[PDB]
Amino acid sequence: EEKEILWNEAKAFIAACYQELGKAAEVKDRLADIKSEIDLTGSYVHTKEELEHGAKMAWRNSNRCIGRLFWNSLNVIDRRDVRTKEEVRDALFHHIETATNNGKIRPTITIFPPEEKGEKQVEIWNHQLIRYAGYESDGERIGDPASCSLTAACEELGWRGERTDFDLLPLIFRMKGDEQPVWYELPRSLVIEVPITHPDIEAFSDLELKWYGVPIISDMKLEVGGIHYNAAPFNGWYMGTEIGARNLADEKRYDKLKKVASVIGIAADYNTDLWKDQALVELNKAVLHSYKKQGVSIVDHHTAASQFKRFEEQAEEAGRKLTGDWTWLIPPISPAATHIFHRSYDNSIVKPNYFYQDKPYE
Amino acid sequence: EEKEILWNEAKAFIAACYQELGKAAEVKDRLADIKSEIDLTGSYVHTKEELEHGAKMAWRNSNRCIGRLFWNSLNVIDRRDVRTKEEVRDALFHHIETATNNGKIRPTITIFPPEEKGEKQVEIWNHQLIRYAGYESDGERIGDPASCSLTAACEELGWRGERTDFDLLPLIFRMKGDEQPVWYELPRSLVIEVPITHPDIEAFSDLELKWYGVPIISDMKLEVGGIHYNAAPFNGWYMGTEIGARNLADEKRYDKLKKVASVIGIAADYNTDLWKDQALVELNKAVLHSYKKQGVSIVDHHTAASQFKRFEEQAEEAGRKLTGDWTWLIPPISPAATHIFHRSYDNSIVKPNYFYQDKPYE
Numbered sequence: 001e002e003k004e005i006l007w008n009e010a011k012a013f014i015a016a017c018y019q020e021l022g023k024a025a026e027v028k029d030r031l032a033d034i035k036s037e038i039d040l041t042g043s044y045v046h047t048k049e050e051l052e053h054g055a056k057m058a059w060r061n062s063n064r065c066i067g068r069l070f071w072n073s074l075n076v077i078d079r080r081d082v083r084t085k086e087e088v089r090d091a092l093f094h095h096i097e098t099a100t101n102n103g104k105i106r107p108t109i110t111i112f113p114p115e116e117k118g119e120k121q122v123e124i125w126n127h128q129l130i131r132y133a134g135y136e137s138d139g140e141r142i143g144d145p146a147s148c149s150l151t152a153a154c155e156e157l158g159w160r161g162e163r164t165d166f167d168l169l170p171l172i173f174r175m176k177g178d179e180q181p182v183w184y185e186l187p188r189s190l191v192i193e194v195p196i197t198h199p200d201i202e203a204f205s206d207l208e209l210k211w212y213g214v215p216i217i218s219d220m221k222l223e224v225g226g227i228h229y230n231a232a233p234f235n236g237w238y239m240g241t242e243i244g245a246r247n248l249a250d251e252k253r254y255d256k257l258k259k260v261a262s263v264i265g266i267a268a269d270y271n272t273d274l275w276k277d278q279a280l281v282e283l284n285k286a287v288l289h290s291y292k293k294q295g296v297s298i299v300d301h302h303t304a305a306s307q308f309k310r311f312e313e314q315a316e317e318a319g320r321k322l323t324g325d326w327t328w329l330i331p332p333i334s335p336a337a338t339h340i341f342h343r344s345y346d347n348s349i350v351k352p353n354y355f356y357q358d359k360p361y362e
Numbered sequence: 363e364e365k366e367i368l369w370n371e372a373k374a375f376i377a378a379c380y381q382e383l384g385k386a387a388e389v390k391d392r393l394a395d396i397k398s399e400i401d402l403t404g405s406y407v408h409t410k411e412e413l414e415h416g417a418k419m420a421w422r423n424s425n426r427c428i429g430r431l432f433w434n435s436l437n438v439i440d441r442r443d444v445r446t447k448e449e450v451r452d453a454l455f456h457h458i459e460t461a462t463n464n465g466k467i468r469p470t471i472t473i474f475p476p477e478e479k480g481e482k483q484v485e486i487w488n489h490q491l492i493r494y495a496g497y498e499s500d501g502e503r504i505g506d507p508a509s510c511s512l513t514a515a516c517e518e519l520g521w522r523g524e525r526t527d528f529d530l531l532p533l534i535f536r537m538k539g540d541e542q543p544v545w546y547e548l549p550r551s552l553v554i555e556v557p558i559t560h561p562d563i564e565a566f567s568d569l570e571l572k573w574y575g576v577p578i579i580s581d582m583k584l585e586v587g588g589i590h591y592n593a594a595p596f597n598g599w600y601m602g603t604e605i606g607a608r609n610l611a612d613e614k615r616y617d618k619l620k621k622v623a624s625v626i627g628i629a630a631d632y633n634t635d636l637w638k639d640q641a642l643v644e645l646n647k648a649v650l651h652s653y654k655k656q657g658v659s660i661v662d663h664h665t666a667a668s669q670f671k672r673f674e675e676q677a678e679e680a681g682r683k684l685t686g687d688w689t690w691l692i693p694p695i696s697p698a699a700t701h702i703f704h705r706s707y708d709n710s711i712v713k714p715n716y717f718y719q720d721k722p723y724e
């Protein structure tokens with residue numbers, strides 16, 4: 001059934017991809033080639049054009065993504081040639097640098113060799129390439145709780161963090177044929193960070209908050225025409241609410257709302273004062289102001305929803321069915337102030353797409 | 363199939379209802395009685411106890427309701443005896459008065475005679491018993507746009523509104539055997555209203571906002587054991603966000619955010635200033651403060667979500683499956699600050715329940 005699955009997905013992908021690229025005539029022969037290559041090799045190899053367009057289609061089909069208007073501008077880096085952990089490490093380093101682009105973030109994806117027979121060539125352990133460590137001893141929480149398990153595995157392997165609230169985790173990945181992963185400290189010169197200040201409340205700096213510039217998701221599988229790229233880290237820029245309404249706000253993350261309330265001079269005693277709501281607003285204002293001030297790309301949730309509406313309009317104009325996950329598309333603050341909240345979306349899964357895969361640790 | 367549908371629902375309802383009431387022994391005989399009554403009459407009549415508990419179960423099963431912790435305290439008024447439009451009008455008047463209770467709102471439902479053979483005895487046209495009119499001539503919007511069609515039908519029938527932004531619509535309903543509905547102006551002494559002021563921004567009163575005290579949904583069908591009560595208006599108290607984040611905020615409702623922004627002294631020019639979010643917070647603070655100050659029951663969304671968590675815990679303890687509609691349960695502001703946002707809910711429909719029915723006008 002496996003060869004048959006591959007061949008079926010390959011058939012559907014190549015037709016659609018070539019159709020979009022005005023290459024419909026070449027479909028018959030390319031599929032012949034693929035059909036034989038599968039017969040022989042047990043798989044097939046995408047052309048540079050198929051791989052690039054496949055990665056773009058996968059972003060366009062990601063139901064949970066509000067940022068999909070810019071799907072066609074994705075910068076696709078082909079690293080199917082890597083064989084060594086040095087080459088992987090350097091490809092990751094390069095990704096960070098070229099995506100960051102001095103703060104003018106470029107949506108980029110780096111594609112590593114695909115799974116062979118469900119056998120990984122490269123297995124990335126990081127959730128994001130740049131992320132903060134999290135610790136818990138004796139009921140003292142330090143850093144990012146979401147990083148607790150990964151941080152414990154890293155320290156198992158000889159890494160030690162300084163136990164600030166913002167320790168950068170090392171890149172950590174395993175190669176086919178190694179029983180253990182390697183880890184490399186991130187060069188500080190590579191990682192842009194943004195201190196969080198408020199446009200008019202000077203005391204906000206007393207919180208000593210910061211966040212990293214570029215979110216680079218490194219644990220999802222890209223699937224294109226039956227080929228499974230388990231290692232294909234990708235990045236855009238942040239929507240401000242991801243940092244201000246979730247990473248820094250959630251009780252199980254940095255849990256900063258009470259501290260925000262105090263520095264902005266409001267009581268955090270009564271539900272009916274809406275102190276959490278007010279704190280959320282000022283913190284989210286701070287995040288947007290801080291990124292724009294430092295010259296690091298970011299989008300607020302209103303602008304992002306406006307862009308997404310254009311995505312919807314563009315999909316209809318191109319004759320493509322639109323798919324989306326309403327529960328992920330609405331922003332975590334003022335969602336009813338966006339058009340997204342007031343309509344419905346078909347949550348069907350269309351391929352190519354990005355998918356979750358099991359963590360190698362835990 | 364219809365008698366069979368009735369008998370099947372009646373079988374399921376009576377068993378469950380009597381079980382909850384510790385009356386399991388009486389199930390066999392009561393169902394015998396019902397079985398024969400259906401055979402004869404084409405239907406059956408609930409006992410006072412069945413009707414009351416049925417109305418309570420229906421609230422408990424309403425997936426979209428965050429206020430369900432208090433389901434068992436529902437005040438059920440049995441008005442299956444009404445035959446005249448005078449009796450209907452007075453029952454509606456009475457509902458408003460006893461639910462309002464000088465501001466200490468009592469969750470109440472008034473139950474009118476059920477449909478016979480899908481034939482309505484009483485057909486209520488109002489969406490809520492207390493609601494504001496909406497007008498549109500020559501591109502001037504006046505009042506509540508959501509009331510536009512109903513307002514047009516009322517004026518068709520001889521009613522005329524003063525065309526303030528807050529005209530109270532008349533009660534309007536039709537009786538079986540009348541071709542037209544009647545309408546009765548609401549006695550002002552019956553309707554509590556709350557002027558919207560802000561705890562520390564005095565200028566907020568310049569907006570001259572107000573809202574009514576008690577939301578009384580009068581267009582849904584209550585279904586209990588196969589009997590269809592198309593006319594059964596019910597009320598709780600407001601969650602503050604329904605007024606501050608939707609009724610007064612939505613572009614297609616009162617659309618007040620820009621005006622709020624101005625009176626609280628912030629620019630409404632840049633998305634990245636989060637002026638809409640800030641306006642939402644201050645307006646919602648105003649709504650809660652104004653109701654509590656006047657002594658009219660209201661709940662903020664945080665307290666409401668805390669109560670709902672208790673509802674979930676109580677359901678599990680009673681061995682009842684919990685059902686809910688995630689997209690309706692999350693509040694329209696700071697939803698990620700409630701536990702609701704971070705879990706999932708089974709959206710199955712269980713009966714008894716409240717259901718939508720087609721409007722008689724439009």
Ligand code: HEM
Nearest residue numbers: 059062064065066067107234235236237238239242299354
């Ligand atoms: C260009 C700027 C972009 C913005 C502002 C943006 C915004 C977002 C946001 C806010 C989410 C929700 C994440 C969460 O709540 O944790 C999301 C999800 C997602 N985005 Fe984007 N995105 C962008 C670019 C991209 C790119 C370049 C890709 C891939 C090529 C992508 C693929 C996805 C996927 C797969 C998800 C869902 C992940 C999951 O299910 O866990 N996005 N996006």
Ligand code: HEM
Nearest residue numbers: 421424426427428429469596597598599600601604661716
């Ligand atoms: C006691 C105070 C109550 C509060 C605070 C409350 C809160 C809410 C809220 C906020 C909604 C969402 C409405 C919207 O977004 O427009 C809702 C929906 C609902 N509530 Fe409640 N509720 C209460 C009592 C009741 C009662 C007494 C009943 C019936 C006996 C009821 C049945 C429902 C139903 C059926 C819906 C959904 C209606 C629809 O689908 O359109 N609730 N409730």
Ligand SMILES: N=C(Nc1cccc(CCc2cccc(NC(=N)c3cccs3)c2)c1)c1cccs1
Nearest residue numbers: 215216217219234235236237238239356357358359
């Ligand atoms: N702005 C962003 N935000 C963003 C975009 C996509 C995903 C995410 C993180 C979403 C998320 C949140 C919580 C858990 C997970 N992962 C899982 N639930 C997993 C299950 C199994 C392995 S991981 C993913 C954040 C971007 C990053 C990269 C491109 S855009």
Ligand SMILES: N=C(Nc1cccc(CCc2cccc(NC(=N)c3cccs3)c2)c1)c1cccs1
Nearest residue numbers: 577578579581596597598599600601718719720721
């Ligand atoms: N706090 C409340 N809020 C509340 C509770 C239930 C319902 C509502 C209104 C929900 C709503 C909003 C928009 C449209 C509709 N109705 C429809 N979509 C219809 C379809 C067909 C006929 S009406 C209902 C508001 C309460 C009122 C009564 C008891 S609690």
Ligand SMILES: C[C@H](O)[C@H](O)[C@H]1CNc2nc(N)[nH]c(=O)c2N1
Nearest residue numbers: 341342343344689690691692693
């Ligand atoms: C289409 C979309 O589901 C719709 O706008 C819903 C969203 N969730 C909601 N939630 C509540 N409480 N009330 C509403 O009117 C709506 N509208």
Ligand SMILES: C[C@H](O)[C@H](O)[C@H]1CNc2nc(N)[nH]c(=O)c2N1
Nearest residue numbers: 327328329330331703704705706
């Ligand atoms: C259970 C629930 O669906 C879950 O918490 C979702 C809700 N919607 C979300 N939406 C976004 N954008 N990001 C998230 O992490 C979540 N979490």
Ligand SMILES: [Cl-]
Nearest residue numbers: 215242243247
């Ligand atoms: Cl993140």
Ligand SMILES: [Cl-]
Nearest residue numbers: 577604605609
């Ligand atoms: Cl309302």
